[PDB]
Design a protein around this ligand. Structure first.
Ligand SMILES: Nc1ncnc2c1ncn2[C@@H]1O[C@H](COP(=O)(O)OP(=O)(O)OP(=O)(O)O)[C@@H](O)[C@H]1O
Lengths: 109, 97, 96, 85, 444, 96, 109, 96, 80
DNA sequence: CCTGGAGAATCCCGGTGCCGAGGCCGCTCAATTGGTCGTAGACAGCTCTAGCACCGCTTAAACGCACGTACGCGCTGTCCCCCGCGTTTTAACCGCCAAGGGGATTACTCCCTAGTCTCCAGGCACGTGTCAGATATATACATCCTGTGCA
DNA sequence: ACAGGATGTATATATCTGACACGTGCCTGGAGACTAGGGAGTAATCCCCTTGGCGGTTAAAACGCGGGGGACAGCGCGTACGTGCGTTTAAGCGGTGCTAGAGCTGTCTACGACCAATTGAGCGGCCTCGGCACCGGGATTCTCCAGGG
């Protein structure tokens, strides 16, 4: 017959859909042929970026005395971190609000 | 005789309060009416999904908030506290609009 | 019956469970993360496609994806993401 | 005879609402002539976004502007929005 | 099985044989332990029977604890006054006012629980669902059961989540446009019985299943008083400009999102729309009537109704029309009273009650399709004028028979204006079909 | 010899001789015009690809090109370009 | 037999290559299929844009008393026409210079 | 002794340089700067002349635009001289 | 190669400012201009060198520079 | 304080030389013409979901108004910093040469990816319950502002 | 300059509820196994173009100095905005009534991919001349002192 099927995500030590990424690459009209390791690499990079964002958001939520993560925590984590701020400079996160920032000229003294 | 906060404390309180929250500030029905009036010019007999107006409101709020941040920066540059249409025009000119 | 829609929600929840075990997420947060993943995928795929067109190649490969990552991600993020991608490709190639 | 129009839609957004937006921005003192300029700027921004969205809806042969159309229009303008598709 | 003449504990109450037999029927329904619907359209009253029921429950085997009565806010003062006048032994409290007033009320009354009957409105009930959910209920009285006719409504969920040992629904219009309304009412009454939405699968089986727990007695069949009304339709034409505007609307800058709505009131009056809406307010002069054939016909028909009687109580379908005509009849050459949703309720009740007058010589009084609830009969009203018909036939029936109280001992007349080859006839035939369905369901 | 290179130079020269019969052009200006044509081609084609993807279709058509032109060109440019393209497609359908 | 080959551009009466546009669209990974009329529409649009910009630049060149268009003339035309300036807002033209304008405050007393 | 007023020669230079179209930075120093900066990212890199020319052109255009925005800021601040804080405000509002 | 930022001199910066349209220049402008030029050039050269690395060459081309500038949103006409 | 010269700076006209633009050929490669086919989309049909127009009630929010206070703005004096100009170095610019590296092309091979078929399991829609978050309410705390000796 | 009174805010506690986390069942797409083919790696060779050097030249930078104008701190003022309080209104939410339009299914056709032969359009190379750069020389205009207006 045929051997037991191991998902390519499980083979690669990832947690993202290598097969779905491969299908999206082949169906996105990006090129004609796609390499075998390209979807694996792309899924790994997506996993790293998602993990970093979720780590920062979880830290913010724990600081704010909360467990569930909300777009406010997501935006707070995205800002206050220069690398992700540069990556997501032009995007707007719905219901994320604005960072607390008052210029020192306005503060009475 | 009655208690009176000096001119500039309540402004700071409101600034902190509104920078602490995340919700919308414009009124939903007036914003929807404005959106429909603008869409009339481009095409008549138009229907709006309820989520589209919400997305438009979110984008408008973000744009206005960012613009006001930069306008405050211009006013502070001019050694002032009150923001002015000249500041708004300068900010738009620099940002390329 | 409604036609199924594909979302990365389950995988993002698995990653969140690995990162912060006892921590949840909201529906709007899930939508934002899904949109973010889609946007990053689109950016990297477009960069790789333009690279392949410039080099007159027809295959998007691991070298193209690595170059796209280095062009898009800012610095230390690019370095660590490159390390992760190389490790993943090594695992997928070593004995598979 | 009692028949007249109430108020045009641009004045739908109010001076206290614009003040709240300026407070979130960080403004402490606001001039009185900022509100008309704010209304004009908002009108221009909405006109651009709505033109792009209506063009997308026209291409789709629909008559209902959708959140996806709005998101695509915003992405084309360069103001990517997360949380609607 | 129960009392055959007036109960000894009523004060000055003169409830007749139909009232006493309804009381016996409701008592027996309580005995067997099932809820029921008191479908008395008019001429019989339900307030008296409900108050008598609760008074019996107090003056007999003691159950003087919590009791909830749901009424529209427009009749709360009337309900409390009637309760005090008829049966003053029980104590009644009301939940009204804003947040601080309701907080004062709950604190000084609700916690001690020195009350037998609590009277509130739908809105206050929604506001204070949490405060009211801490108390068990034994007889939940609700009037106008069509208020919960549909599911997915917040009130339906709130009233379902309530803990009531028994329930009592008061309604005069049990069926409106489909059997799923009666099914909703029956499901609310007996959720463990009418779980499923399910000529023999119709009409007759419906009658047989509704017989055990429903009462429906006609005022004419009970009292034989209240001489029947005469209903007259008038096939009115429309002006050439009206036809041209109707065409230019129908085939297609102005907004016409809801095509049926925007191509509707056209027959009522042309200038109702925008574009050709009244321009410069020159003066209140002869400009409005000449442009609409319906109001021209109304002006022509005025003198004969003016020669005698002449209390009309005209009914129109558009509030726009109601308010303009309300402020219009004074200028035309008459005196009026105004009823609208913009008039405050607390003032409204006493205002209309006082405006009930033996001699006014005012000739005009206007009520909307919705603005009129259920009360206050003008015995001087003789000719009912229906400018336009609503989709719901039961609303038209309520507007028609609000003058059919006993206060009215003269035969009353109904005038109906209908246009030609338009959607008004569509609305009329739909209303006729729904009214016939209600008649066959509740009478056969 | 040298491998062949492609450019719109001859067509640009034809259009120049058409609009201004007695005006010449230099190599730098020709290269600038070639880059301009390439950039406009890239923008329109990418927008049309995005449109076809959004509507879930696998063909690029005149409708998609026209919609992309409306999205990209502002105002009078869009109007006149749409008129020109419609006229050209009408002539091509007629003369086929 | 057959007939003399007629170019698609000539059939559409265009000066731009419909065949070359079609080949570029096929080899561009834009979509799997390309309609017949799309290259014609694109060629007409490209021709119109080129004609507009060339007319403006040639008028400027004649105004400068030269019979050869240069990047300076192209830049002047693009920056003076507002529609073309909005189209080319973030485009730099080599050897182009800038528009002559001096802020009115810096002009002397 | 002939001496112009302090500020007319500046206006003459402004007009002359806004009329001119040629480069303003010394080519050999710019080339050395480019090679020195490129030494960090790679060792023993070779350059085409056109690459350095394009880099110089882009640098000139960027600096000219930056100075224009800085002049606007200084004029807004009731001044005719430009300052480092003006340059910083221009950068901050442009998006850096 | 060392301290070649000094090659960009004060007269050149003054000429650039005059083309921009400024009349008076502060004495501290020059260091700021050198810094902004440094960061801009660093970004562009980094992207171009990445393109050259992918192409597996040792020479940086005008096409690579144009590709980097188009990535940054500063399209250049006249070099390919 | 408006005229009048004196002095640079600039422009306009004419002559001269050079290099890039524009025209003319060969050929080869990409575009044209003819014919076949299969699949994507056009067209028709149907269900049901959501969108539009309209009523009553509540209540937060908007609107209007009066008082006073920081704040924007005009003006003045000081001083130091930047500019204009002449002079000395300094290095860029240009022309020429020599050499080697490396970019570009061509041919050959093989290995990696497209395409197919089969099957099965991961992923999605749907219900359902319970716990984290939202809210009300009552303390404790921090902060702001103004009055009273002495600053 | 502190003391104290009046606001506001942060915090603890108790209820309640609805959205999230998990389950279940099914089904569509991903994995396993195989076959072909053409894209790309690899080697070799050519030539061009980048770099290093060197000399002569002249324009450009660096440096110093005198002086005027612009930056900046200070003062005075009138006034437009912030704060609070009372009155009105229309937003928000809950319902009514209706139907149009989106979204999925199914069939058929006509349109674009694919292939083969043919050919003329466009590209690289080549050559000549005239448009443009440069130079010179005279005419014109702008700017800045000096003082008589
Ligand atoms: N005390 C009474 N004795 C006898 N008949 C009465 C009495 N009260 C009311 N009725 C009858 O009821 C008619 C109207 O009564 P009422 O106005 O109280 O009705 P209602 O409570 O508004 O009606 P509904 O049952 O529809 O709610 C009278 O005309 C009369 O026939």
């Amino acid at each position: 017959t045929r051997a037991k099927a191991k998902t390519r995500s499980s083979r690669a030590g990832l947690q993202f859909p290598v097969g779905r990424v491969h299908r999206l690459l082949r169906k996105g009209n990006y090129a004609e042929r796609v390499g075998a390791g390209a979807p694996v690499y792309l899924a790994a990079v997506l996993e790293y970026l998602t993990a970093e964002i979720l780590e920062l958001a979880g830290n913010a939520a724990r600081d704010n005395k909360k467990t569930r993560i909300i777009p406010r925590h997501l935006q707070l984590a995205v800002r206050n971190d220069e690398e992700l701020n540069k990556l997501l400079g032009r995007v707007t996160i719905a219901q994320g609000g604005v960072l607390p920032n008052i210029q020192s000229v306005l503060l009475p003294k | 005789k009655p208690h009176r906060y000096r001119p500039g404390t309540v402004a700071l309180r409101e600034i902190r309060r509104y920078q602490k929250s995340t919700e919308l500030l414009i009124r939903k029905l007036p914003f929807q009416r404005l959106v429909r009036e603008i869409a009339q010019d481009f095409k008549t007999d138009l229907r709006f999904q309820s989520s589209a107006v919400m997305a438009l409101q979110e984008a408008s709020e973000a744009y206005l908030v960012g613009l006001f941040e930069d306008t405050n920066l211009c006013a502070i540059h001019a050694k002032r506290v009150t923001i002015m249409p000249k500041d708004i025009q300068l900010a738009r000119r620099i940002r390329g609009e | 019956r409604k036609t199924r829609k594909e979302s990365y929600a389950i995988y993002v929840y698995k990653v969140l469970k690995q990162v912060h075990p006892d921590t949840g997420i909201s529906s709007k947060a899930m939508s934002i993360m899904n949109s973010f993943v889609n946007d990053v995928f689109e950016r990297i795929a477009g960069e790789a496609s333009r690279l392949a067109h410039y080099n007159k190649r027809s295959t998007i490969t691991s070298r193209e994806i690595q170059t796209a990552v280095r062009l898009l991600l800012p610095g230390e993020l690019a370095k660590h993401a490159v390390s992760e991608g190389t490790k993943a490709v090594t695992k997928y190639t070593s004995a598979k | 005879r009692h028949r007249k129009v109430l108020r045009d839609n641009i004045q739908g957004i109010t001076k206290p609402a614009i003040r709240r937006l300026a407070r979130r921005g960080g403004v402490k003192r606001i001039s009185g002539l900022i509100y008309e300029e704010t209304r004009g700027v908002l009108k221009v921004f909405l006109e651009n976004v709505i033109r792009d969205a209506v063009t997308y809806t026209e291409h789709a042969k629909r008559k209902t502007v959708t959140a996806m159309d709005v998101v695509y229009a915003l992405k084309r303008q360069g103001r990517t929005l997360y949380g609607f598709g | 099985t129960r009392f055959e003449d007036s109960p000894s504990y009523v004060k000055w109450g003169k409830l007749r044989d139909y009232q006493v037999r309804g009381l016996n029927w409701l008592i027996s329904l309580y005995e067997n332990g099932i809820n029921g619907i008191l479908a008395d359209e008019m001429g019989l009253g339900k307030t008296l029977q409900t108050i008598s029921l609760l008074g019996y429950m107090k003056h007999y085997r003691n159950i003087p604890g919590p009791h909830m009565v749901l009424v529209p806010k427009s009749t709360l003062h009337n309900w409390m006054s009637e309760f005090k006048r008829w049966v003053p032994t029980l104590r009644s409290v009301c939940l009204i006012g804003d947040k601080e007033q309701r907080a004062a009320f709950v604190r000084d009354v609700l916690l001690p629980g020195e009350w037998d009957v609590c009277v509130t409105s739908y809105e206050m009930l929604i506001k204070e669902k949490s405060v009211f959910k801490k108390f068990n209920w034994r007889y939940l009285v609700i009037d106008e059961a069509h208020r919960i006719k549909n599911e997915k409504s917040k009130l339906s969920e709130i009233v379902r989540e309530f803990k009531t040992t028994n329930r009592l629904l008061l309604t005069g219009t049990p069926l409106q446009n489909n059997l799923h309304e009666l099914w909703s009412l029956l499901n609310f009454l007996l959720p463990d019985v009418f779980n499923s939405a399910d000529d023999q699968k119709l009409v007759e089986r419906l009658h047989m299943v509704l017989r055990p727990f429903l009462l429906r007695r006609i005022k004419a069949d009970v009292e034989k008083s209240l001489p029947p009304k005469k209903e007259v339709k008038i096939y009115v034409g429309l002006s050439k400009m009206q036809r041209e505007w109707y065409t230019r609307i129908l085939m297609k800058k102005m907004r016409l999102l809801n095509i049926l709505m925007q191509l509707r009131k056209c027959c009522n009056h042309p200038y109702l729309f925008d574009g050709a809406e009244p321009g410069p307010p020159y003066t209140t002069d002869m400009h409005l009537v000449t442009n609409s054939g319906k109001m021209v016909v109304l002006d022509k028909l005025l003198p004969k109704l003016k020669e005698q009687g002449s209390r009309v109580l005209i009914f129109s379908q558009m509030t726009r029309v109601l308010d303009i005509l309300e402020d219009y009849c004074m200028w035309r050459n008459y005196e009026y009273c105004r009823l609208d949703g913009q008039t405050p309720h607390d003032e409204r009740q006493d205002s209309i009650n006082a405006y009930n007058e033996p001699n006014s010589t005012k000739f005009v009084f206007m009520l909307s399709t919705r603005a009129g609830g259920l009360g206050i009969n003008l015995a001087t009203a003789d000719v009912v004028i229906l400018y336009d018909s609503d989709w719901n036939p039961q609303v038209d029936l309520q507007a028609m028979d609000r003058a059919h109280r006993i206060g009215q001992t003269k035969t009353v007349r109904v005038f109906r204006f209908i246009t030609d080859n338009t959607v008004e006839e569509r609305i009329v035939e739909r209303a006729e079909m729904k009214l016939r369905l209600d008649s066959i369901v509740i009478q056969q």
